[PDB]
From Swiss-Prot, chain A:
Shown segment, full-protein numbering: 1004 to 1053 of 1053
Protein name (Swiss-Prot/TrEMBL): Mgp-operon protein 3
Disrupted gene: phenotype observed: Probably essential, it was not disrupted in a global transposon mutagenesis study.
Disulfide bridges in this chain: none
Location in or out of the cell: Cell membrane
Residue spans of biased composition, Basic and acidic residues class: 34-50
Region (Disordered), start-end ranges: 21-50
Superkingdom to which the source organism belongs: Bacteria
Swiss-Prot record, chain B:
Similarity comment: Belongs to the adhesin P1 family.
Cellular localisation: Cell membrane
Name under which the protein is recorded: Adhesin P1
Parent-protein residues present: 1349 to 1396 of 1444
Job description of the protein: The protein is the major adhesin mediating the attachment of this mycoplasma to the ciliated epithelium.
Membrane-spanning segments: 5-25
Length: 50, 48
């Protein structure tokens, strides 16, 4: 994430390169945390006290 | 002593039956639980 900012900074440092009309469609938002609840299957060894 | 032969024929098989049933339950009940635990453990391993 710190290198993607280096060309843009260079592009930004040379304003004479007419921003290639990057057609930069905005970074599609990291898919939201697979909300898959690892329900830790607590294997409750119920020690049936015979 | 010696009067007891006819009740010994009744009593011996009954004790054997009780002891056999108890042995069956004592071995049988945990074997079912072990199976379930093993399955659960493998299931969890697979999930992990």
């Amino acid at each position: 994430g710190v290198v993607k900012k280096a060309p843009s900074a260079l592009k930004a440092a040379n304003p004479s390169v007419k921003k290639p009309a990057a057609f930069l469609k905005p970074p599609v938002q990291p898919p939201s945390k697979p909300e898959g609840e690892q329900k830790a299957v607590e294997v409750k060894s119920e020690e049936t006290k015979s | 002593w010696a009067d007891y032969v006819l009740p010994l024929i009744v009593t011996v098989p009954i004790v054997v039956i009780i002891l056999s049933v108890t042995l069956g339950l004592t071995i049988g009940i945990p074997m079912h639980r072990n199976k379930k635990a093993l399955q659960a453990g493998f299931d969890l391993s697979n999930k992990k």
